[PDB]
């Protein structure tokens, strides 16, 4: 359902000690050694919400990998009431 682009070559190569605040929100290429590793956790990709008044499943919403998404309006019953994520109908992503 989606194709990911990975850039292969890129001129400038940095060491971890050279980085400064002029490099923020920019493309970088670095070297190093891997010292620790965590397990595989799932991350929310296509999220479905429940309306706890009229029991409805609200459709796919996308997660940007920046901040958690929250809804506010039920289209069928017209409410801003409690809303909870449907774990069973959600599709997740790999994280490490």
């Amino acid at each position: 359902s989606e194709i990911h682009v990975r850039i292969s070559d890129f001129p400038t190569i940095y060491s971890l000690r050279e980085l400064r605040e002029s490099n923020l929100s920019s493309l970088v290429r670095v070297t190093g050694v891997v010292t620790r590793r965590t397990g595989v956790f799932p991350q929310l990709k296509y999220v479905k919400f429940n309306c706890l008044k009229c029991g409805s499943i609200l459709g796919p919403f996308f997660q940007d990998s920046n901040e958690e998404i929250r809804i506010s309006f039920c289209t069928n019953c017209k409410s801003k009431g409690p809303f909870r994520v449907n774990g069973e109908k959600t599709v997740y992503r790999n994280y490490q």
Binding site: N50, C54, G55, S56, I57, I71, S72, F73, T75, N76, C77, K78, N86
Partner: protein, 289 residues
């Protein structure tokens, strides 16, 4: 960007009304084109067309269709007029900067209907009726195209069409905000029209044996307001419309009701009443006898 569906017959009738406007000749000139210039010399807003002219072109067609489905075709006829004005009168399109509201007026129909002969199969068509005027109200402004502000975000949505009711926008235009219910109204930067209500009664000679007179409410807009006095016999040309009526709750019979279909919704209440009464909206008012 979703593709909007178009009415093919609407396009054909628009093209036909454009040919009607630009190619009519009477013993020789183009009368409507002359009136067009006449409206720049004095800054008017209304166009008066004669119905007998509509019939003759394309024997048995353009006029039959416009009369029978006026409610549908009116916006397309307005757009055609706009395109003709763009061509031969582009300075008139601006109020002396907002756009100028245009009104069309048909008259001189073949037949005049009695008040006690109006039926519900003529809803949304063009007809002419007669009656006696009893009561008039003062002129008040009417909401036509409104401006709304979002309450989650603050964006501006302008030129919302009301169409006989207080309509609100159903989707924030920003691809990010997901607001669909919460809006506020800027009454300073909204466009209004002029509105009056007239009450009419059946003529004395047209009442059946043993019965009492009937009444009807007439709505006037724009430049047609304040042409009818109390105690007059007038002829009205306009469109037969329906308005909500809560007085019918109590009459015998089955009263239609509305509900939302729950077949197809994934699950783990908004019933509205369809009660209406027949009213009349006028474009031409004439006082006869």
């Amino acid at each position: 960007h979703v593709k909007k569906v178009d009415d093919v017959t609407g396009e054909k009738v628009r093209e036909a009304f454009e040919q009607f406007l630009e190619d009519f000749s009477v013993q020789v000139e183009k009368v409507y084109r002359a009136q067009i210039e006449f409206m720049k010399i004095y800054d008017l807003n209304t166009i008066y067309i004669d119905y007998q002219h509509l019939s003759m072109r394309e024997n048995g067609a353009l006029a039959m269709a416009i009369s029978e489905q006026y409610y549908r075709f009116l916006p397309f006829l307005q757009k055609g007029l706009r395109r003709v004005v763009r061509k031969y009168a582009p300075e008139l399109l601006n109020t002396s900067q907002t756009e100028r509201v245009f009104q069309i007026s048909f008259f001189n129909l073949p037949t005049v209907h009695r008040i006690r002969d109006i039926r519900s199969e003529k809803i949304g068509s063009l007809l002419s009726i007669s009656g006696t005027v009893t009561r008039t109200s003062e002129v008040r402004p009417e909401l036509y195209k409104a401006s709304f502000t979002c309450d989650m975000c603050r964006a501006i949505v302008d030129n919302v069409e009301q169409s006989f009711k207080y309509t609100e926008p159903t989707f924030c235009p920003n691809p990010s905000c997901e607001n669909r219910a919460f809006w506020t109204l800027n009454v300073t930067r909204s466009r209004f029209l002029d509105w009056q209500k007239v009450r009419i009664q059946e003529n004395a000679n047209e009442i059946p044996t043993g019965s009492m007179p009937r009444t009807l409410d007439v709505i006037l807009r724009g430049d047609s307001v304040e042409r009818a006095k109390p105690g007059d016999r007038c002829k009205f040309t306009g469109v037969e419309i329906v308005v909500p009526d809560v007085t019918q709750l109590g009459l015998p019979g089955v009263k239609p009701s509305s509900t939302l279909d729950t077949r197809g919704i994934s699950k783990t209440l908004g019933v509205r009443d369809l009660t209406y009464k027949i009213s009349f909206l006028a474009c031409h008012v004439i006082s006869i006898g």
